[PDB]
Design goal:
This is part of a larger assembly, with 1 copy of chain A, 1 copy of chain B, 1 copy of chain C, 2 copies of chain D, 1 copy of chain E and 1 copy of chain F.
Chain A (H helix, E strand, L loop, with lengths): L1 H7 L2 H22 L9
Chain E lengths: L5 H7 L14 H7 L1 H25 L14
Chain F lengths: L34 H34 L7 H9 L7 H24 L40 H31 L4 H10 L19
Helix pairs in contact in F: 1-4
Classes of the chains: A mainly alpha, B mainly alpha, C mainly alpha, D mainly alpha, E mainly alpha, F mainly alpha.
The structure holds chlorophyll B, chlorophyll A (3 copies), phosphatidylethanolamine (2 copies), astaxanthin (2 copies), the ligand CC1=C[C@H](O)CC(C)(C)[C@H]1/C=C/C(C)=C/C=C/C(C)=C/C=C/C=C(C)/C=C/C=C(C)/C=C/C1=C(C)C[C@H](O)CC1(C)C (3 copies), beta-carotene and 1 more.
PDB class: photosynthesis
Keywords: photosystem I, light stress, photosynthesis
Entry title: Structure of low-light grown Chlorella ohadii Photosystem I
């Protein structure tokens, strides 16, 4: 189990997971808050 | 408007008087501090440029203050420039004031 | 009006653009049923287009002769005419998030640089440490200013390698 | 030193024995001794010139002859200058020529002397002989008065460039309503 | 007997506090002795002037009937 | 050392220990690792807490009196505008500049005190009043002129307790002011109005129903 | 000492031999000797100025010549300043300049003297020469009268800023209805 978690912590796996999480978060932000041209607060 | 003879003469006389009795000390001090142009540590004449030798008709003059003829021409040129600037500006009859 | 720009609310080109886009969408919608999947998708697109145009006109954006929104990137000019959310506020937001990520990475690199084997820590990231440093990176402005005023944020020029000129 | 410009701070060591010194040098401009000497001479000269300018600006208005800003207007529009009411028979060209010559001679004589004589020449500029007796205190008084005059001259220029009035008029207007007539109320100083 | 000495002017352009180090000491000889330095300075100036000429001839036509010639401009 | 911590079971960071008032080992972001930075943050916390206490008092007490009937004052968000429309109302720009001018002098003096506590006690600085400007050794706690009644001067432990009470009240007031800002922005009503509306129906009147805290896009 | 301010308190030791000293210094403003000396001189000077001001305020009112608040009012909105029922031919500018020059000279000569002479200068300032022969009791009476006059002047200012009437009218109004005419009735002093 330790070796598996160590493999999941490698640079490529972590890079792909981080990019996927960031892309998913951005996609959902644009899905619920679309066409945000300016920062209207 | 302004008399060309009077303006030109007055400006030239004033420039010569300023360069002979007022600006002469600072001019001489600056000349001594600067000196002749040097290339690689020696003057142009010392390096081999014969045409760079200082003229002898300015090395020593009978004027007690050392006011050479070249000094006369330089100050007269400045005086004439100022005189003609005054004459030209006075000749125009337009409003250049920013008010 | 800032630089000869007309507000999108009173812009005729803006309204014409919205009308044309909705018209094209309805023309495409006319070739389907009333409750079919393509019809519902086209109706949703029409609603989104109308909402977008209404929001742009209501937010106070400035439109040019072409009828498209224009952004004002100048403090003072955008602050006095109510356009701070165009570039000013987004600039602050970016700078903050960018500094957060940069500070988290810097702290992780400096923390693993003291380990006996830092290269492995660079290829095999320490998830708990990275998570803690990512959380700590949110206070990056305060930490960065403190380190700058402390002198620990910089490396002495005499300690950095340089070329032989 | 007598002063500190900031009670809780450390002042530079090169500004300890100087007259009218408060240790004010946050930018460290006078770190070099040569620059410090030049700055001292220039400060005294600027203070004297500003004292004369402030006295003239206030006198021309108090006596009722006009403001400093409108003084050269009758000479540039197409007339003659006025001094105490009389008409001066000189134009812009002649005035500039005489002033240039006189100032050139005076400044050349002043700038061609020793460093101390260029700022404190009591040989003939002190007929009353006031220097031969506690000159440090008098020097401090002169420097402080010159500093105040410099600030006053800059204030006159900025105030006129912002509101367009004159020193006495500006002072009267501010005294009429200090809470609502100041730099914060004009639409120039504050970008509101 | 009158005029300036570029060497002295360069040697005098040394700001105090040593912000610029020695300043421009020895620059006169560095430029006079090296032909590549002079050629580089001349080329930089000439290129900038060429750009200035290009930017000024279209916005401020100096020749008659030049603005009407779209191909030539 | 063994004093109560913010999160029971979690050890306090070594950079905090237990000497500053209000020390509960709360620093998940490790902002106060540097001693100089920690000192500056301590002074900033004291200043923010005191100003927040004054503001929350000036916002709650007048509101409570107004609700009863005695002393009628406008709501805190409209108090600034109400005075603006007054007859002899001072211009906003001039008023702000005067306040900033006075605060410049006092705050700069306090700033010098932070760098060196006995800075303002320099002899000859003022007209004999500098003697009363010497701190107590810790920036942010200046006796002399301040603290005229001498509260907590009986012993060192008495002063420590008062410091803890001050820090807790300041933090509570800071959180309260942030709540006031958020409540007014979300609901255009006063704090007392919000409290009364919540008690009437807590499950139907809270931040989950104001329409601002929870975005309508998600629902 | 002759007094204790707070019957059971412990008065400071540096205020045990000074005249008219009750040990009142809870803030500890006179801990340093220099500050104590400056404050002593300032207190005596303030007491003298306050006694003179209170005497003038009461005299101008009991003599039916006007109030203290409206005294400079006729000068503004026109001109002409009345004195003893007569007329003075001076404007605000001349009056301010004259007062500034006279006060500047007097204070400059007073402030440049020795510390003791800056507060208790005998000789020419005591024409009757009653200073000799136990001046401690006289000094105590002077300080106490000055404190009372200071409080009276502050009372005049505060009362006028609250009610709006001058001293004599306020006194008569309070004497007429001592139960319903006081500081508690006006909507300024006691709010709740
Ligand atoms: C201690 C300070 C003091 C000051 C600042 C003033 C100031 C003033 N008093 Mg005054 N008084 C003072 C003390 C006293 N007054 C009076 C009795 C009066 C009266 C009865 C009147 C004034 C009036 C005035 C005003 C006339 C202007 C003026 O100076 O005319 C010029 C005054 C002088 C040149 C005085 C010269 C005195 C010198 C020859 C001895 C003025 C604002 C007048 C007023 O208010 O009119 C509207 C007025 O009628 N005062 C008494 C005696 C009780 C004072 C005792 O200390
Ligand atoms: C530097 C270049 C740049 C910049 C400044 C922008 C800026 C923007 N784009 Mg754009 N885009 C770009 C490049 C860029 N884009 C490129 C190269 C492409 C091709 C792939 C696109 C394709 C694209 C599309 C298809 C759309 C946008 C949209 C937007 C707007 C949406 C803002 C938002 O997401 O809401 C707010 C987001 C947040 C508040 C999240 C902030 C916090 C994050 C998670 C931090 C990230 C940390 C790492 C915004 C103004 C959308 C839009 O509506 O246009 C107006 C949209 O539909 N972009
Ligand atoms: C470079 C050689 C040179 C020399 C040596 C002179 C010398 C002289 N010029 Mg001349 N000038 C020159 C070049 C020169 N000029 C050039 C190139 C121009 C064309 C711009 C002029 C135009 C010019 C004008 C218009 C006048 C002179 C005048 C004079 C005389 C001035 C006398 C004087 O001070 O009046 C007397 C001094 C007072 C009254 C005081 C003087 C002898 C003036 C003249 O003729 O004198 C009357 C005069 O009016 N010059
Ligand atoms: C990045 C470069 C930049 C440029 C080209 C400008 C340009 C301009 N600014 Mg600006 N500004 C900038 C940066 C810049 N700013 C930054 C970084 C800030 C934040 C401190 C501001 C804050 C600011 C304010 C508050 C104002 C301007 C204003 C202006 C306009 C007139 C002021 C002026 O230039 O007069 C001369 C400038 C001198 C220094 C003299 C002008 C177009 C003014 C405006 O809005 O116009 C009405 C205005 O009041 N700016
Ligand atoms: C170095 C530059 C030269 C500086 C010279 C300054 C000293 C000489 C100045 C004399 C100038 C001069 O005489 O011209 C007058 C104008 O003055 C200047 O315009 C002409 O006087 P005017 O004839 O115009 O005045 C008629 C009134 N009767
Ligand atoms: C109401 C008007 C009251 C005006 C009273 C002014 C009296 C001023 C005299 C003060 C004085 O004598 O001090 C001298 C200062 O020495 C000196 O330097 C001489 C200064 C004297 C100036 C002349 C004053 C004339 C103007 C008076 C107008 C009336 C003596 O020396 P000291 O300092 O020890 O004082 C001890 C004096 N008992
Ligand atoms: C009567 C009159 C005229 C005027 C005549 C004169 C001659 C006026 C004089 C003007 C002067 C000479 C002003 C000087 C004006 C001088 C001024 C304004 C200089 C100010 C300097 C300041 C405030 C501080 C600097 C610094 C210090 C010292 C440090 O130590 C660093 O570390 C940091 C740092 C802060 C940068 C007229 C021509 C108008 C015509 C009218 O009809 C008349
Ligand atoms: C369980 C659990 C985890 C949870 C961690 C959380 C979550 C912590 C929460 C912090 C806060 C402070 C939450 C606030 C949580 C508060 C709220 C309110 C959350 C969601 C509510 C929504 C989305 C509804 C909105 C509506 C809409 C928009 C309407 O239209 C109107 O009708 C009104 C209304 C009905 C209100 C774990 C990680 C430990 C471990 C596992 O993974 C699991
Ligand atoms: C050298 C010698 C030596 C010998 O032996 C002796 C003898 C003779 C003594 C001598 C000489 C001397 C002299 C000359 C002196 C002079 C001085 C002066 C002039 C000063 C001024 C000086 C001056 C000055 C300070 C000035 C100042 C000013 C001011 C503050 C102003 C203010 C103001 C302003 C801003 C603005 C407003 O709206 C108004 C007012 C309010 C108005
Ligand atoms: C600790 C820590 C550490 C870790 O590591 C991290 C973290 C987590 C981040 C942290 C936390 C933090 C926090 C929480 C903060 C907050 C703060 C605040 C809230 C402040 C306020 C603060 C606040 C304040 C000052 C306030 C004040 C107020 C005032 C004055 C008021 C005023 C007023 C009045 C009277 C009345 C009128 O009519 C109006 C007005 C004008 C309005
Ligand atoms: C000691 C201590 C110590 C501890 O530790 C702390 C503490 C507590 C702080 C303390 C206390 C303090 C106090 C009590 C103070 C107060 C003061 C005052 C009140 C002053 C006044 C003061 C006052 C004063 C000078 C006054 C003056 C007056 C006058 C001139 C008047 C004038 C006049 C007249 C004649 C008339 C006319 O028609 C008008 C006039 C023109 C108006
Ligand atoms: C020896 C002698 C003497 C002296 C004399 C003299 C003083 C002479 C002179 C002379 C002169 C008198 C000189 C002058 C000179 C120079 C000149 C004269 C120049 C010039 C020119 C120019 C450079 C111009 C230019 C122009 C033109 C061409 C055009 C228009 C523009 C202008 C103006 C830029 C005596 C008696 C003392 C002593 C003994 C002997
Ligand atoms: C308003 C202004 O511009 C200057 C005012 C100066 C003063 C009060 C100086 C006063 C004295 C002090 C305290 C020290 C020695 C000299 C003085 C006259 C006794």
């Amino acid at each position: 189990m330790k070796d598996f978690t160590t493999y999941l912590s490698t640079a490529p796996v972590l890079t792909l997971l981080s990019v996927t999480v960031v892309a998913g978060l951005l996609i959902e932000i644009n899905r619920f808050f679309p066409d945000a041209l300016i920062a209207a607060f | 408007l302004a008399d060309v003879n009077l303006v030109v003469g007055g400006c030239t006389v004033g420039a010569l008087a300023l360069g002979r009795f007022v600006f002469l000390p600072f001019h001489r001090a600056s000349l001594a501090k600067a000196g002749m142009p040097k290339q690689n540590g020696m003057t142009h004449l010392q390096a081999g440029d014969a045409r760079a030798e200082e003229a002898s008709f300015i090395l020593k003059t009978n004027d007690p203050a050392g006011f050479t003829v070249v000094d006369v021409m330089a100050w007269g040129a400045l005086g004439h420039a100022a005189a003609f600037y005054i004459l030209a500006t006075s000749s125009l009859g337009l409003d250049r004031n920013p008010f | 009006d800032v630089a000869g720009l007309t507000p999108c609310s009173e812009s005729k080109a803006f309204a014409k653009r919205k009308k044309n886009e909705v018209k094209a969408l309805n023309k495409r919608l006319k070739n389907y049923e009333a409750d079919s999947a393509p019809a519902l998708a086209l109706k949703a697109t029409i609603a989104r287009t109308e909402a977008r145009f209404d929001k742009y006109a209501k937010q106070g954006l400035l439109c040019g002769t072409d009828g498209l929104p224009h952004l004002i990137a100048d403090p003072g000019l955008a602050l006095r005419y109510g356009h701070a959310g165009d570039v000013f506020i987004p600039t602050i937001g970016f700078i903050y998030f960018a500094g957060w990520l940069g500070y988290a990475g810097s702290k992780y690199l400096q923390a693993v640089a003291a380990t006996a084997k830092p290269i492995e820590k660079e290829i095999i990231i320490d998830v708990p440490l990275a998570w803690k440093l990512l959380w700590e990176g949110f206070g990056w402005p305060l930490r960065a200013f403190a380190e700058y005023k402390n002198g620990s944020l910089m490396e002495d020029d005499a300690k950095i390698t340089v070329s032989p000129r | 030193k007598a002063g500190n410009w900031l009670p809780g701070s450390e002042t530079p060591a090169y500004l300890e024995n100087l007259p009218a010194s408060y240790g004010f040098d946050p930018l460290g401009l006078a770190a070099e001794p040569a620059s410090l000497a030049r700055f001292r001479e220039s400060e005294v000269f600027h203070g004297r010139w500003a004292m004369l300018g402030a006295a003239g600006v206030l006198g021309v208005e108090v006596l009722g002859y006009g403001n400093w800003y409108d003084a050269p207007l009758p000479l540039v529009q197409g007339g003659q200058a006025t001094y105490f009411g009389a008409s001066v028979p000189f134009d812009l060209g002649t005035l500039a020529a005489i002033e240039f010559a006189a100032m050139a001679g005076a400044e050349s004589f002043r700038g061609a002397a020793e460093p101390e004589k260029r700022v404190y020449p009591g040989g003939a500029f002190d007929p009353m002989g006031m220097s031969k007796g506690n000159s440090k205190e008098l020097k401090t008084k002169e420097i402080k008065n010159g500093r105040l005059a410099m600030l006053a001259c800059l204030g006159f220029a900025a105030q006129h460039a912002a509101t367009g009035a004159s020193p006495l008029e500006a002072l009267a207007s501010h005294l009429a309503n200090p809470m609502a007539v100041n730099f914060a109320t004009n639409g120039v100083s504050l970008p509101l | 007997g009158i005029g300036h000495s570029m060497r002295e002017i360069l040697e005098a352009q040394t700001p105090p506090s040593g912000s610029l180090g020695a300043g421009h000491k020895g620059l006169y000889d560095t430029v006079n002795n090296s032909l590549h330095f002079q050629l580089g300075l001349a080329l930089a100036s000439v290129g900038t002037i060429s750009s200035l000429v290009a930017q000024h001839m279209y916005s401020l036509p100096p020749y008659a009937f030049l603005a009407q010639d779209f191909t030539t401009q | 050392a063994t004093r109560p911590l913010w999160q029971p079971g979690v050890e306090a960071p070594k950079h905090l220990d237990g000497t500053m008032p209000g020390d509960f080992g709360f620093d998940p972001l490790n902002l106060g690792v540097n001693k100089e930075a920690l000192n500056w943050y301590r002074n900033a916390e004291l200043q923010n807490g005191r100003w927040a206490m004054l503001g929350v008092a000036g916002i709650v007490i007048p509101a409570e009196l107004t609700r009863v009937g005695v002393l009628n004052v406008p709501e805190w968000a409209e108090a600034g505008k109400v005075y603006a429309e007054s007859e002899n109302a001072i211009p906003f720009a001039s008023l702000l500049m005067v306040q900033l001018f006075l605060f410049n002098f006092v705050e700069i003096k306090r700033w010098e005190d932070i760098k060196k506590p006995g800075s303002q006690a320099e002899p000859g600085s003022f007209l004999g009043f500098e003697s009363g400007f010497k701190g107590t050794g810790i920036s942010g706690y200046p006796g002399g002129a301040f603290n005229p009644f001498g509260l907590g001067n009986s012993s060192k432990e008495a002063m420590d307790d008062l410091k803890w009470r001050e820090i807790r009240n300041g933090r509570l007031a800071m959180v309260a002011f942030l709540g006031f800002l958020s409540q007014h922005a979300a609901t255009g009503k006063g704090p007392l109005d919000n409290l009364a509306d919540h008690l009437a129906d807590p499950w139907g009147a809270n931040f989950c129903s104001n329409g601002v805290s929870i975005p309508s896009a998600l629902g």
